[PDB]
Design a protein around this ligand. Structure first.
Ligand SMILES: [Mg+2]
Ligand SMILES: [Mg+2]
Ligand SMILES: [Mg+2]
Ligand SMILES: [Mg+2]
Lengths: 216, 216
């Protein structure tokens, strides 16, 4: 795995980074990138290689500023993933909200310094996620990891995340993929290397933060 | 395009069908399949070739039976896409809810004859969509088209849909895809042919239904 300072620099440079949570938690790797300048072409890559459920981790302060309430008042998710109501960008260039162009635009608009509630149509096709106030030390999730990277890299407090799936194998002429799943551990590292990305664990990210904050 | 009776037969056989809405509406093609027996391997194919925002069109009667309220009370979507709260399957085999296995399971459970509200965790990673009571003649959307195909094919009243994107081109060693977009018209037909699927338009589906119901 790469050292956290090196992951931070790549993130500050607007690159995706590959982040693995604990094997005892989801044991999944997500692509994580700063939302502020995610490009159409980057989003297309993200959609191609992930589950396609493109989420946007943001702080509680941003969910209040942008008027993004939780999708459900009584959260039945076992991890408590804090989905807000979904959004599309209110912009003349938006069409159906689902294209790489449109999803990237929604993410950049969520991160804009001048963002306001009226800039988003609800419901939509991008899923903001409310990070907990305590950050990665408090909840060891990809939501917190994305917001933490934004803070560490001096970026706007909105990230973009999605899980890296194992799409299995193509079957010529048949609408199925054999042996699909989720990418794990070493394969996630190999994926990062193939695409020129840094890769790390939330555990190491927490160790980095503890250098300044101590153990929660 | 294939004739609607032939599309119906393929759908009855548990295949995906490719359905295009009007060029004046979204001008998009979706993969549409009956939810009742969608397999893990089919779902992996669907995720690989679509936006990855896997939705499950169902009837108003099913949204009441399964206790799936609309995600937003004041819908700001320009088409009124009727998203309910999202779900994951409450089953011992579910892990994080996002894998092809887990998403396919949620879809099959939504379609089960014995389905009940407690069978779904909210929020989650599959997005049910409430078709309007009037069907395709009333709202010419992919949501209605999926429910209409289930009715026409004698299937349970729950479909699975997602938009077919244009993932653009791979760029060796770089985390971007060039020139991405949405698949359109002839390219959608070509996609169907490559994968052994039937392809049609919502306009022809409405013409089929009008043979029995007349024009709305
Ligand atoms: Mg749409
Ligand atoms: Mg996660
Ligand atoms: Mg998760
Ligand atoms: Mg549609």
């Amino acid at each position: 795995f790469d050292a956290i300072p090196d992951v931070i620099q790549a993130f500050k440079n607007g690159e995706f980074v590959v982040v693995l949570d604990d094997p005892s938690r989801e044991n999944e790797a997500d692509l994580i990138i700063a939302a502020e300048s995610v490009t159409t072409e980057q989003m297309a890559f993200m959609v191609r290689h992930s589950s396609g459920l493109i989420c946007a981790p943001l702080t509680p302060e941003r969910t209040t500023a942008l008027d993004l309430p939780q999708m459900v008042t009584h959260n039945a998710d076992p991890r408590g993933t804090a989905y807000t109501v979904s959004v599309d960008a209110e912009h003349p260039s938006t069409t159906t909200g689902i294209s790489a162009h449109d999803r990237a635009l929604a993410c950049r608009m969520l991160a804009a310094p001048d963002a306001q509630p009226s800039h988003f149509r609800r419901p939509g096709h991008v899923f903001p996620l409310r990070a907990v106030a305590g950050g990665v030390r408090a909840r060891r999730g990809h939501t917190e990891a994305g917001v933490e990277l934004c803070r560490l890299a001096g970026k706007r407090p909105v990230a973009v995340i999605s899980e890296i799936v194992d799409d299995g194998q193509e079957v010529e002429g048949r609408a199925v993929r054999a042996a699909p799943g989720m990418l794990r551990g070493d394969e996630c590292v190999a994926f990062a290397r193939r695409w020129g990305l840094k890769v790390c664990t939330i555990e190491d990210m927490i160790a980095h933060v503890e250098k300044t904050e101590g153990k929660l």
